[PDB]
Design a protein around this ligand. Structure first.
Ligand SMILES: Oc1ccc(-c2ccc(-c3ccc(O)cc3Cl)s2)c(Cl)c1
Ligand SMILES: Oc1ccc(-c2ccc(-c3ccc(O)cc3Cl)s2)c(Cl)c1
Lengths: 10, 239, 235, 9
């Protein structure tokens, strides 16, 4: 997925 | 949502504590600027700020109530606006200059080598001069920045009641802004005038962002400076 | 200046009386549709200039400053007008009484289907808020005076100009509040609605900026000399 | 420019 979509969890 | 139960002071305190740190640039005073090197500093700085922005966004009341897809969209739309208003805010006490970083304080002449930088620079300076003239307060600033996050991408099935949720939070920040101005001792008439004045500036911040995207993508299409994959994906979102 | 001496009702009346007429399209392929929109916009521009001169405080400005404001805001003004008269037509844009388009028709040209959807979303928002005509003319006047007031310029005469614009802008804000208070809205509701209306201007700004891009890359098949000059102001 | 002319007329 998008890096942004990944960072909004971690 | 718990965000709607927050008082004005609770709203203010939450936003103030959620504030991201002021980061330093990788500026090297041993060498003169080139278009590539200057863009290198700015994009490297922006990228490191993006990580802090994402966490700040999570601490903005009502934001985590949204789906991940909605959170992505809002940040994709407003990230440069949010970077700019922060830049403008910390440049307030520096007339004629923009404080990108404590070790990167520039005037309009220093970025003449960068494509389209001077144009955006002047617009940023004008915004900074406006905030200074209006004596923008820190509590007002964090309200405006949160508004940008929630508003900028709100107009782009079932979850239309979450669009309702965004507007209710935006209404809460409006109440908070008024509450601040009243606390500052402004008359009732001065409150709705200042509110209008502050929000109209967002129209210009939006304008600067769009002009910024236009130049950033152009340089990206010329391979001026290697961008992080995150920054590439943020740019492609506007394309 | 008479503009600062006007009352709230007088401000409303002046703005309502200054309203431009609704023009018709002299009236597809991937050229016919584009031609209709641009020809329409060009003819509306002529009437927009008359309207601008009737906006309280605008004639107090220098010709240079009047030019600057119109060059910056002309597409914004066209869009909010389009959005306004498209309010009662959900999922449709009313460019002209004989030119009512849906989003599928907007696909017939380059890169407008995105702009089309944003205009529809803006129209839907106004419909949701039940935007009133007296409020609409206030917003459009705000756009004219605000949109280019930060790209002005030192030269204390210029600071005198920008300060005059801000006083007129504060006046229009007072007018908006007056309208809402007349509608029976509470103090809290007034502030909130005022904020809601002004945040939409940010989206109108956005639509114009994206619109400037496409029309600039479409400049091929015919734009009028005036329209060509208006476009070269954003480049 | 044309906008100049129109504003005067
Ligand atoms: O906290 C920050 C960090 C970086 C930037 C910028 C990053 C890239 C910029 C740039 C440079 C040249 C140009 O033509 C347009 C832009 Cl947006 S400005 C900003 Cl506005 C705030
Ligand atoms: O009352 C009017 C009349 C014309 C227009 C338009 C004229 C040209 C437009 C256009 C066409 C294609 C495109 O790609 C982008 C735009 Cl903004 S839209 C508008 Cl927004 C309002």
């Amino acid at each position: 997925h998008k890096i942004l979509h990944r960072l909004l969890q971690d | 949502s718990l965000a709607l139960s927050l008082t004005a002071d609770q709203m203010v305190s939450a936003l103030l504590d959620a504030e991201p740190p002021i980061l330093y640039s990788e500026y090297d005073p041993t060498r003169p600027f080139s278009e590539a090197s200057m863009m290198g500093l700015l994009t490297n700085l922006a990228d490191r700020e993006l990580v802090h922005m994402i966490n700040w966004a999570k601490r903005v009341p009502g934001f985590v109530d949204l789906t991940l897809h909605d959170q992505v969209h809002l940040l994709e739309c407003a990230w440069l606006e949010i970077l700019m208003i922060g830049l403008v805010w910390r440049s307030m006490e520096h007339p004629g200059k923009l404080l990108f970083a404590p070790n990167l304080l520039l005037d309009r002449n220093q970025g003449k080598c960068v494509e389209g930088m001077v144009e955006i620079f002047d617009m940023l300076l004008a915004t900074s001069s406006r905030f200074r003239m209006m004596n923008l307060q820190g509590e007002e600033f964090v309200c405006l920045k949160s508004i940008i996050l929630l508003n900028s991408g709100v107009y782009t099935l079932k979850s239309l009641e979450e669009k309702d949720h965004i507007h209710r939070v935006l209404d809460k920040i409006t109440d908070t802004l008024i509450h601040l101005m009243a606390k500052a001792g402004l008359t009732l008439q001065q409150q709705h005038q200042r509110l209008a004045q502050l929000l109209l500036i967002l129209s210009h911040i939006r304008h600067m962002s769009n002009k910024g995207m236009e130049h950033l993508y152009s340089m990206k299409c010329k391979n001026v400076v290697p961008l992080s994959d995150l920054l590439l994906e943020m740019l492609d979102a506007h394309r």
